[PDB]
C-alpha cells in the first residue's frame, strides 16, 4: 500500500495555481500525498499535476469520481494517468463493468484505482448508503485494493473496513469542515483526507501540524 | 433548448485536431455538441471557447458531476466560466448535491441536465432500482432537463412519464451501444450520438444518414 506520511492527505481544492502551489508548499514538511480534483484541474489544466510533481515530489491522487460507461471511463483514466497521476478515485455506483474498465487501464499503465463506496455528505443517505455494502463487496470481488469511505459516519466506515478486510487500504474524507474527527476516523481508515481545515487556515502549516499532533 | 435536427454530437475524440476537423465535417447538421472529460482532460477547458469561436454551437459539458455539494458548486463554476451552456449532473449522490449545481446554473444563466438511469449494462446493478425515485427528486427540485438511456426504451419511456411532456429529455446509447435513433425519439427530444459519427469513415454521411432515418 502507499505509505502516506503522517496518515494525512491534503485535498487541494483551491482554484487558482498561485494559491494552490503556495499552500501545498507550506505543508510539504507534513504531507507527501496530495489529492487533486476537478476544482483545481478544470481551473488550471491537467498540467497542474506535472507542476505539483516538479515542485513538491508528492504522490498525486486524482479525485475524479469517475462515473461514466466503461468506454468513457477507460479514456478518462488513460488521460489522467498520462498526466502523471499515481491513482484515480472511481465511483462504484455505476456498477462492475465501469469499475473493471478503470482497473484494466490502471493495470496496463501501472497505477492504482481507489473505489469510492459511500460518500460523506448528507445526500449520500438517499441512494448511495443503501448500496454501499454491496458496492464494497463488488470491489473486493473485482480485486480492488484501495477504497474511500466517509469520516462523517463512523459506523459505516467501520462496516466498510470489515467488508474490505485489514489488508486493503482505506482513506476517508469529511474530517474537519464536514464534522468528522481525525482520531476516530483513524480507528478504521489508514489515512484521512483533509481540505478546508488546512487550505482555508490563516497558517496551513500550523493547521496541518495541529491535526497531526492530535493523532499522536 | 432547440437542438438542430434533434441530434447532439458526443465529441469524445481526444486530440484537438481530430475533434475540430470531425466537428467541422458535421457542422451543417448540428448546432449542439456535448463535450466530456476525454476531450477536456486531453486538451484543456479552453477547447470549449474554441468550439464556440469556430462553430457557434451550444456546448453541453458531460461531466456527470457526482461530488459533495461544496465541490459540486466549484465544478459548476469552473465549467460555466469555460463557456459551457449546460452541465450533466448525476442524481444518485442525492438532492443536496443536485441543488448545489442548480444554484450555480441559476447564477450564471445556464442549465443543469439530471442523469437518472445510465445506458451501459452496469447501470442495472444499482442505478436502475433508484432511477424512478431520482427522476421524482428532479421533479421536486424543479429540474427541467434530464438524461436517460436509449438502450432501454421502456425505462426511457418511464422517465418521460415521470417528468412529463414539458420537460426536456436527451438520450445517449444510440448506435454503438445498440439504441435505435427513431425509437429513442419516440420519448426523448434529442439523441446523443458519439462513435457512430466520429469513428465513421465519412462522419458527415453518418450524420446525414441518421437524420434521414428520423
Ligand atoms: N472525494 C470525496 C468523497 C466524499 O464522500 N466526500 C468528500 O468530501 N470528497 C472530497 O474530499 C474533499 C473533502 O474536503 P474538505 O471537506 O476537508 O474540505 C473534497 O475534495 C471532496 O470533494
Ligand atoms: N453521459 C452518458 C450517460 C450515459 O448513461 N451513457 C452515455 O453513453 N453517456 C455518454 O454519452 C456518449 C455516448 O457516446 P457513444 O456511445 O454514442 O459513442 C459518451 O460521451 C458517454 O460518456
Curated annotation (Swiss-Prot), chain B:
Active site: 64 (proton donor)
Name used for this protein in its record: Orotidine 5'-phosphate decarboxylase
An annotated GO BP: 'de novo' pyrimidine nucleobase biosynthetic process
Disulfide feature: none
Molecular functions per Gene Ontology: orotidine-5'-phosphate decarboxylase activity
Function: Catalyzes the decarboxylation of orotidine 5'-monophosphate (OMP) to uridine 5'-monophosphate (UMP).
Keywords from the UniProt entry: Decarboxylase, Lyase, Pyrimidine biosynthesis
Keyword hit for Zinc: no
Source species of the chain: Methanothermobacter thermautotrophicus (strain ATCC 29096 / DSM 1053 / JCM 10044 / NBRC 100330 / Delta H)
Similarity comment: family membership: Belongs to the OMP decarboxylase family. Type 1 subfamily.
UniProt catalytic activity: orotidine 5'-phosphate + H(+) = UMP + CO2
Subunit structure: Homodimer.
Superkingdom classification of source: Archaea
GO cellular component term of the entry, any: cytosol
Enzyme kind, highest EC tier: lyase
Pfam families: OMPdecase
Pathway: Pyrimidine metabolism; UMP biosynthesis via de novo pathway; UMP from orotate: step 2/2
Amino acid at each position: 500500500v502507499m505509505d502516506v506520511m503522517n496518515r494525512l492527505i491534503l485535498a487541494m481544492d483551491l482554484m487558482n495555481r498561485d494559491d494552490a502551489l503556495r499552500v501545498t508548499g507550506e505543508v510539504r514538511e507534513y504531507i507527501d500525498t496530495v489529492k487533486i480534483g476537478y476544482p483545481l484541474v478544470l481551473s488550471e489544466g491537467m498540467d497542474i499535476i506535472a507542476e505539483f510533481r516538479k515542485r513538491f515530489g508528492c504522490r498525486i491522487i486524482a479525485d475524479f469520481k469517475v462515473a461514466d460507461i466503461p468506454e468513457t471511463n477507460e479514456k478518462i483514466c488513460r488521460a489522467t494517468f498520462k498526466a502523471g497521476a499515481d491513482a484515480i478515485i472511481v465511483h462504484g455506483f455505476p456498477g462492475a463493468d465501469s469499475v473493471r474498465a478503470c482497473l484494466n487501464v490502471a493495470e496496463e499503465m501501472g497505477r492504482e484505482v481507489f473505489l469510492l463506496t459511500e460518500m460523506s455528505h448528507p445526500g449520500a443517505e438517499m441512494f448511495i448508503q443503501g448500496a454501499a455494502d454491496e458496492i464494497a463487496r463488488m470491489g473486493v470481488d473485482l480485486g480492488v485494493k484501495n477504497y474511500v469511505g466517509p469520516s462523517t459516519r463512523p459506523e459505516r466506515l467501520s462496516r466498510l473496513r470489515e467488508i474490505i478486510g485489514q489488508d486493503s487500504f482505506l482513506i476517508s474524507p469529511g474530517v474537519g469542515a464536514q464534522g468528522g474527527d481525525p482520531g476516530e476516523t483513524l480507528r478504521f481508515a489508514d489515512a484521512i483526507i483533509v481540505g478546508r481545515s488546512i487550505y482555508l487556515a490563516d497558517n496551513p502549516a500550523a493547521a496541518a501540524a495541529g491535526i497531526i499532533e492530535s493523532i499522536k
